[PDB]
Amino acid sequence: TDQAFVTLATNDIYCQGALVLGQSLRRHRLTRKLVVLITPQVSDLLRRILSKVFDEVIEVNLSADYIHLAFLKRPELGLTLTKLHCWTLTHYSKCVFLDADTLVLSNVDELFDRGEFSAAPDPGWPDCFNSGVFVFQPSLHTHKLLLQHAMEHGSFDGADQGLLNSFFRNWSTTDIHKHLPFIYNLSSNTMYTYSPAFKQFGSSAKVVHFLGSMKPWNYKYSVSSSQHQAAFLHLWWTVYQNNVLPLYK
């Protein structure tokens, strides 16, 4: 197929997220390619392990002048621009990007029925999308425009979510079909309290997104944590213990 799931691991620790994400996709009847972007900081060891899960392991480094300039002008956007490398994967016609701190709970192949740029609303400011999960179409032209926009204006939150919301500015007003249902990117903040909405709709979750400074891998050898958050932490570790830990050996 000419379609893929894409994620990003910027260091050996974050590879744990990518590996769990990757295996969660394989558990639920994988029909697409799996791609992981990495930085030069990812060790040869983790590369061999990643290769047991991902069809492609692609190191992002420095490349054309238009890329160099953005990177050198705005060092703070180094990881953002690394993520945007996903738009250069032009051997795929359509991709779903998933951040390495997400977990797939069910087959989500229906996401490929969506067109660029499709994303779920972000809690807190719901007229912005969360950039942890989105459907895009690789294009060198789009990549150039994104980087020119990054170079020219930067990001209003210093991260990829601000840059992407700024570029795909009409997301909240144009076409409802590019609004992914919230269950395709369910923030782990939403389940800190057992709210009526979460009780009513939470069970239909297809992808969970672990936010906060405390990632799932930080719980294994001081920020508050919920029982219902803990539940999803346990699902993450179930995939890790059963589908990832064996790979390391």
Residues 33 and 249: beta-carbon distance below 8 Å: no
Region of 27-35, 107-115, 123-131, 137-145 interacting with a copy of itself (CB under 8 A): 123-131
Q: Which of 144, 148, 217, 247 binds a copy of itself (CB under 8 A)?
A: 217
Amino acid at 167: F
Min CB(101)–a copy of itself separation in Å:
11
Residues 6+ apart with CB under 8 A from 245: none
Which is nearer to Mg ion, 101 or 122 (by Cβ)?
Answer: 101
d(CA 143, CA 80): 12
Order of strands, edge to edge, in the sheet holding 33-38? Answer: 56-59, 33-38, 3-9, 94-98, 129-136, 118-121
d(CA 85, CA 60): 7
Residue 110 interacting with a copy of itself (CB under 8 A): no
Residue tagged 């890329």 (tokens): 67
Tell me how many degrees the CA angle 123-125-128 measures, rounded to the nearest 5: 95
User: Would you state the structure tokens that stand for residue 17, as one six-digit string?
Assistant: 């997220």
Residue 108 touches which member of Mg ion, a copy of itself, none, C-beta under 5-8 Å by kind:
none
Residue 52 interacting with a copy of itself (CB under 8 A): no
Residue 93 touches which member of Mg ion, a copy of itself, none, C-beta under 5-8 Å by kind:
none
d(CA 134, CA 130): 8
Residue tagged 């795909």 (tokens): 168
d(CA 121, CA 123): 6
Region of 11-19, 23-31, 89-97, 138-146 interacting with a copy of itself (CB under 8 A): 11-19
Which is nearer to Mg ion, 132 or 202 (by Cβ)?
Answer: 132
DSSP state of 122: P
Write the residues followed by a gap in the chain (C–N more than 2.5 A).
62, 221
Percentages helix, strand, coil for the chain (3-state, rounded to 5) are 45, 15, 40
Residue 99 touches which member of Mg ion, a copy of itself, none, C-beta under 5-8 Å by kind:
Mg ion
Residue 132 touches which member of a copy of itself, Mg ion, none, C-beta under 5-8 Å by kind:
Mg ion
| Footprint on residues 89-148 left by Mg ion (CB under 5 A) | 99, 101, 132
User: Binding site annotation covers 248?
Assistant: no
Residue 43 interacting with a copy of itself (CB under 8 A): yes
User: Binding site annotation covers 8?
Assistant: yes
Region of 23-31, 88-96, 115-123, 142-150 interacting with a copy of itself (CB under 8 A): 115-123
User: Binding site annotation covers 249?
Assistant: no
Interface positions with Mg ion (CB under 5 A): 99, 101, 132
Binding residues for Mn(2+): 99, 101, 209
Residue list for the binding site: 8, 10-11, 14, 74, 83, 99-101, 130-131, 157, 160-161, 209, 212, 215
Can you say which residues are annotated as belonging to the binding site for UDP? 8, 10-11, 14, 74, 99-101, 209, 212, 215
